[PDB]
Ligand binder design. Structure first.
Ligand SMILES: Nc1nc(=O)c2ncn([C@H]3C[C@H](O)[C@@H](CO)O3)c2[nH]1
Ligand SMILES: Nc1nc(=O)c2ncn([C@H]3C[C@H](O)[C@@H](CO)O3)c2[nH]1
Ligand SMILES: *[C@@H]1O[C@H](CO)[C@@H](O)[C@H](O)[C@H]1NC(C)=O
Ligand SMILES: *[C@@H]1O[C@H](CO)[C@@H](O)[C@H](O)[C@H]1NC(C)=O
Ligand SMILES: *[C@@H]1O[C@H](CO)[C@@H](O)[C@H](O)[C@H]1NC(C)=O
Ligand SMILES: *[C@@H]1O[C@H](CO)[C@@H](O)[C@H](O)[C@H]1NC(C)=O
Lengths: 121, 121, 121, 121
């Protein structure tokens, strides 16, 4: 009932497209953000993830990594695909954004955390 | 200099094997835990991820998703491959563990966070 | 311009009252939830925290700890008091929920993470 | 058996002192870090927290906020006081570091996450 395939937009205005999910639950996609004002446009970064196929849940958990094309950073997202109080699909996710640091002594401050909610575009 | 390919063990005793990383930074492997019980014995779950290839860093960031085979949960891990002060390779990671919930009203309690440090096996 | 003192409600329906903030940035208050059951009905737990007073910012950061009265758990919340784009006060927060575990070997799964957004009641 | 009162040091070399905990579980302390090389010394910031007193656990959960004196940031810590495989006390904590941002549009990148382990000084 809740399928990851398709076009999504989030609460900060980023968009993401996800292709077909195979029988192993693997999928690829693209992740688009602004930077920043009306002016001007965008960066596209690839994403790769898997949805959990245990018990063929109608609302499966999933995870994906975005391999940023314009920085040395990586973000991972994890969450669950829900049906809301009737019909519309919603991805409730949390993410970790990992910055590159040059010294292992700075490792402690390299990880940001937050949320995103996605709806169909 | 720090390469994800190979066998790793962490601070809680789980092991992980990662395969070759392709020119897009993509890799697959397997994640093994313990400590359930048995006279052994373990579970093996596949993982899929990407290493960031921007500026061909010697200590790249990376993320991967573990698609648990024995539960409806997903974990994502993000971190950086370092050469430590002592010259040995280490993966400093943080993870989010997403539990499946039945109602979107329980979404708030579905995410655990923690760390893992990996060294070569 | 954004002051923590007063009554707040969040996105999950919990309410919070915060008292006066003293010259050191210290405050006390109460945190109320739902949605257990009853014909009511609620639990009230005390909270204690500090607002950062450096540079007398109009949108200060702050943290507080809620000492749950009905469990062995603790939550900490950190965030910033903003004047939103629409001119209304909002607390954008993130929290960690620490569960009590009996063995130090289960420490790895004792921490949940999430967000809460508060507006004036 | 595990009491928060006393002098502690962590895995990054920060120290913290915590005073007496009252009957409500409230405590104050001081949090000291370096910045950075042998040269030279330190900053001291106050801390305020509470330990959970439910079921008078020998290994209670606790939380505290550090109100940084040299920045507009706030950190909160939550964790549990353990006795380890015999006699020595250990605080296993996780933290959220909240940076001040000027626009609510940057709120999403304002929170870092990590761990600290403390032992008696
Ligand atoms: N080793 C290890 N380190 C982690 O950080 C971690 N985070 C989650 N998990 C796995 C464990 C269960 O398979 C599974 C429980 O569904 O979650 C982890 N395992
Ligand atoms: N409203 C609200 N928002 C949170 O982010 C949050 N995080 C933790 N908790 C509280 C709820 C239970 O009292 C208690 C369960 O021990 O944890 C929260 N309550
Ligand atoms: C997301 O998609 C819509 C088009 O449907 C567009 O208006 C907007 O510019 C997009 N946002 C980004 C970050 O590209
Ligand atoms: C990890 O590998 C080592 C072999 O070096 C083995 O002793 C250990 O039991 C393995 N752990 C798991 C969880 O399989
Ligand atoms: C929060 O306060 C409002 C009154 O504005 C009340 O309707 C609601 O039930 C309260 N929630 C809780 C959890 O007490
Ligand atoms: C912590 O305490 C010890 C003294 O016991 C000292 O060597 C060290 O400088 C301290 N570290 C900091 C950050 O002050």
């Amino acid at each position: 009932k809740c399928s990851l395939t398709g076009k999504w937009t989030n609460d900060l205005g980023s968009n993401m497209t996800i292709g077909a999910v195979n029988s192993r639950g693997e999928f690829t996609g693209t992740y688009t953000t602004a930077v920043t004002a009306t002016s001007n446009e965008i960066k596209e970064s690839p994403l790769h993830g898997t949805e959990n196929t245990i018990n063929k849940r109608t609302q499966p958990t999933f995870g994906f990594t975005v391999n940023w094309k314009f920085s040395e950073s990586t973000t991972v997202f994890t969450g669950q695909c829900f049906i809301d109080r009737n019909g519309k699909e919603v991805l409730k996710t949390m993410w970790l954004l990992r910055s590159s640091v040059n010294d292992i002594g700075d490792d402690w401050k390299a990880t940001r955390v937050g949320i995103n909610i996605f709806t169909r575009l």
